[PDB]
Amino acid sequence: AAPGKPTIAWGNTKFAIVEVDQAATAYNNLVKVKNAADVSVSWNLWNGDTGTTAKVLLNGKEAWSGPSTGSSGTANFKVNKGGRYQMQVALCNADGCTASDATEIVVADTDGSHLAPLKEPLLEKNKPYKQNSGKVVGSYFVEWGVYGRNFTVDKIPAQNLTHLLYGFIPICGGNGINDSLKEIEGSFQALQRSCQGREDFKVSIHDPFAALQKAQKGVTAWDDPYKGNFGQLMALKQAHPDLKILPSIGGWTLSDPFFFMGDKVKRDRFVGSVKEFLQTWKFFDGVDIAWEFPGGKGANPNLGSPQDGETYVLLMKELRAMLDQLSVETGRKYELTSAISAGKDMIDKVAYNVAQNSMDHIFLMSYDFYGAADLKNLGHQTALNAPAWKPDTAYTTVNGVNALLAQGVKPGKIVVGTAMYGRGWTGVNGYQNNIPFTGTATGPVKGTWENGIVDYRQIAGQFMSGEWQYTYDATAEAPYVFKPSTGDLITFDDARSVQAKGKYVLDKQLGGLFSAMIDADNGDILNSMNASLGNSAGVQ
Numbered sequence: 139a140a141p142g143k144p145t146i147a148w149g150n151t152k153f154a155i156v157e158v159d160q161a162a163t164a165y166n167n168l169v170k171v172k173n174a175a176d177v178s179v180s181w182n183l184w185n186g187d188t189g190t191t192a193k194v195l196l197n198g199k200e201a202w203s204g205p206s207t208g209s210s211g212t213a214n215f216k217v218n219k220g221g222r223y224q225m226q227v228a229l230c231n232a233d234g235c236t237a238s239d240a241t242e243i244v245v246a247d248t249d250g251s252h253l254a255p256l257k258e259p260l261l262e263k264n265k266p267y268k269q270n271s272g273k274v275v276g277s278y279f280v281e282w283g284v285y286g287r288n289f290t291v292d293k294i295p296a297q298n299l300t301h302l303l304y305g306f307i308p309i310c311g312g313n314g315i316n317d318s319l320k321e322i323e324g325s326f327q328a329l330q331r332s333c334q335g336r337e338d339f340k341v342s343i344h345d346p347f348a349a350l351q352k353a354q355k356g357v358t359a360w361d362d363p364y365k366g367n368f369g370q371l372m373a374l375k376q377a378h379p380d381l382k383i384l385p386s387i388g389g390w391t392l393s394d395p396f397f398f399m400g401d402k403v404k405r406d407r408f409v410g411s412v413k414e415f416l417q418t419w420k421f422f423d424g425v426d427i428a429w430e431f432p433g434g435k436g437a438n439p440n441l442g443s444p445q446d447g448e449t450y451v452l453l454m455k456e457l458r459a460m461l462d463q464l465s466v467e468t469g470r471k472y473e474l475t476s477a478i479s480a481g482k483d484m485i486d487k488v489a490y491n492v493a494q495n496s497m498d499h500i501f502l503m504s505y506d507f508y509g510a511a512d513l514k515n516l517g518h519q520t521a522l523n524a525p526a527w528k529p530d531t532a533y534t535t536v537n538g539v540n541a542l543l544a545q546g547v548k549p550g551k552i553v554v555g556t557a558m559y560g561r562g563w564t565g566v567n568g569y570q571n572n573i574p575f576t577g578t579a580t581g582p583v584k585g586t587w588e589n590g591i592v593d594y595r596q597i598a599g600q601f602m603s604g605e606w607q608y609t610y611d612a613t614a615e616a617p618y619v620f621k622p623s624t625g626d627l628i629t630f631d632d633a634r635s636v637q638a639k640g641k642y643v644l645d646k647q648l649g650g651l652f653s654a655m656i657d658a659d660n661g662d663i664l665n666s667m668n669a670s671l672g673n674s675a676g677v678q
C-alpha cells in the first residue's frame with residue numbers, strides 16, 4: 139500500500155533571500171545578500187508506512203528528495219525566487235505517493251514579492267488621478283519624516299505620482315568627507331556607525347532604523363524581514379508596479395563626498411557601490427543624483443572646484459553605463475536622474491547639453507529662490523516669472539529653464555519644481571506701495587519644524603484666515619501671505635501657481651513637475667500638479 143499521509147511539523151515558515159541581522163548597526167552586517175533562501179521543513183507520520191522516499195514539493199514541484207528513514211524527518215533546501223508557496227511533504231513507495239496537506243511558506247526578497255500590496259486610501263485633500271498625460275509627476279519623501287512629522291510611506295498618495303524619490307542615501311566617509319553632517323546633532327556620528335568597516339565613497343543607509351526596522355503598516359510582524367520605509371516601499375511597488383521609486387544620493391547635507399569624485403578611484407568605487415545597492419534593494423528603479431552642487435555654494439563653504447562640471451558629466455556617463463549593464467542583466471529599465479540648482483550661474487558650471495544624453499530626467503530645483511538666509515532682499519521663492527516691481531529678478535523658474543535650453547538641453551528632459559512649503563520672514567518693514575517684498579526683515583518666520591520654513595498644510599490651515607492678507611501675483615505667478623501686525627511674510631506655491639507651472643510645462647513641451655517634500659502637502663499641490671499636466675481624474 140502507499141505510505142501514510144505525513145503531517146508537516148509546526149515550525150518557522152518565513153524565509154528570506156536577503157537576510158537582515160536584527161542586532162547590527164553597521165550596514166555591512168545589517169544586510170546579507172544570498173543567492174537563495176535557506177528553507178527547512180520537518181514532518182511526522184502518525185498512521186501508516188513511512189514510505190521509502192520523502193519529497194518536499196513547492197506548488198507541486200520537487201524542491202528536495204531523500205530517503206524516508208523513520209517516522210519523522212527534516213529537509214533543508216534552497217529557494218531562489220521570492221513569493222509565497224504551497225508546500226507539501228510527500229512520502230512515496232512503489233505503491234504510490236501520499237502528500238500532506240499544504241502549508242504556505244513565505245520566501246522574502248527585496249522586490250516585495252512576498253508582500254501584500256500596500257494600497258491605501260487617499261488622505262487629506264488628495265483626489266485620484268490617472269497617470270495618462272505622459273508627463274513626469276514626481277515627489278521626494280524624506281527618510282526622517284516618519285519621526286516628528288509622522289509621515290510614513292502608507293500616507294504617500296502614490297497613485298498620483300509617476301516618480302517617488304527617497305531622500306537621502308548617504309556616501310560613506312568621516313572627517314573631511316561628510317563634515318556638513320556635523321551641523322546636525324548626532325547625524326555625523328550616525329553615519330560613521332552605519333559605515334563602520336565600510337570603505338569611504340560607498341553608499342550606505344543613514345538611518346537603518348527608519349529605513350528597515352521601524353514597525354509600519356503592513357510590516358509589523360517580528361519576523362517580517364524588511365520593515366520601515368524600505369519594507370513599505372516594496373509593498374508599494376507591489377500595488378503600483380509602474381511607479382518609479384528612485385533612491386536619491388546626496389541632498390544638502392550629504393553632498394560633500396561628490397566633491398572628491400574627480401579621483402576616478404573613488405568615483406569607480408562609488409558607481410560600483412550603487413550597482414550593488416540596486417542589486418540588493420530590488421524595488422528601486424535607478425538612481426537620482428542630488429549633488430548640491432558642482433562648483434560649491436552648497437552646505438560646505440570649503441568645497442567646490444572648477445573641475446566639478448567635468449566630474450559631473452563623467453559621473454553621469456559612468457552611472458548610465460552601469461545602469462545599462464544592470465538593465466540587460468535584469469531585463470528591467472533603469473532611470474538616471476539628477477536634482478540640480480535652478481540658478482543660471484550654477485547651471486552654467488555644467489555642460490548639461492552633454493550630460494543629458496545619460497539622463498532620463500533633470501529635476502530643476504526651481505524653489506528656494508529667496509528665504510530667511512537673506513533678510514534684506516525679499517522675493518518670491520518659487521515663482522515662474524519676475525514680479526512687476528523687479529522685472530530683472532535673476533532667480534525665477536523661467537530663467538532656470540531658459541539657461542538649460544540655451545545650452546542645448548532638450549525641453550522634454552526638464553522637470554519643473556514646485557514647493558510644498560513656504561519660506562518666510564518676520565518683522566518685514568519699510569516697504570512701499572503695499573508690496574511687502576520691497577521692505578526688509580528682522581528674522582525668519584517661525585517654522586513648522588525648522589526656522590523660516592512652513593509646511594503648505596500649515597499655510598492653508600492656519601495662515602489663510604484672521605489678519606493674514608492673501609495675494610496672488612499674476613505677473614510672477616506666485617501667492618503670498620502677509621500678517622501686517624508682526625511683519626510675517628510667507629512665499630509659497632498654491633494650486634494656481636502650480637497650475638501656471640503645469641500649463642507652462644505643456645506649452646514649452648517640458649518633462650513634467652516634481653516637488654519637495656511630499657509630507658508637507660495637504661493634497662492641494664499634488665492635485666494641481668496632476669490636473670495642470672492634463673492627467674484625467676479617476677482611477678486607472
Ligand SMILES: CC(=O)N[C@@H]1[C@@H](O)[C@H](O[C@@H]2O[C@H](CO)[C@@H](O)[C@H](O)[C@H]2NC(C)=O)[C@@H](CO)O[C@@H]1O
Pocket residue numbers: 390391430479503505506507509511
Ligand atoms: C534649492 C537650494 O539650493 N536651496 C538652498 C537651501 O536648501 C538652503 O537651506 C538648507 O536646506 C536644507 C534642506 O534642503 C537644510 O537641511 C538646511 O538646514 C538648510 N540650511 C539653512 C542654513 O537654512 C539655503 C541656505 O541658505 O540655501 C538655499 O536656499
Ligand SMILES: *[C@@H]1O[C@H](CO)[C@@H](O)[C@H](O)[C@H]1NC(C)=O
Pocket residue numbers: 282306322388389390391392588
Ligand atoms: C536639512 O536640515 C534639517 C534640519 O537639521 C535636517 O533634518 C535635514 O536632514 C536637512 N536636509 C537635507 C536634505 O540635508
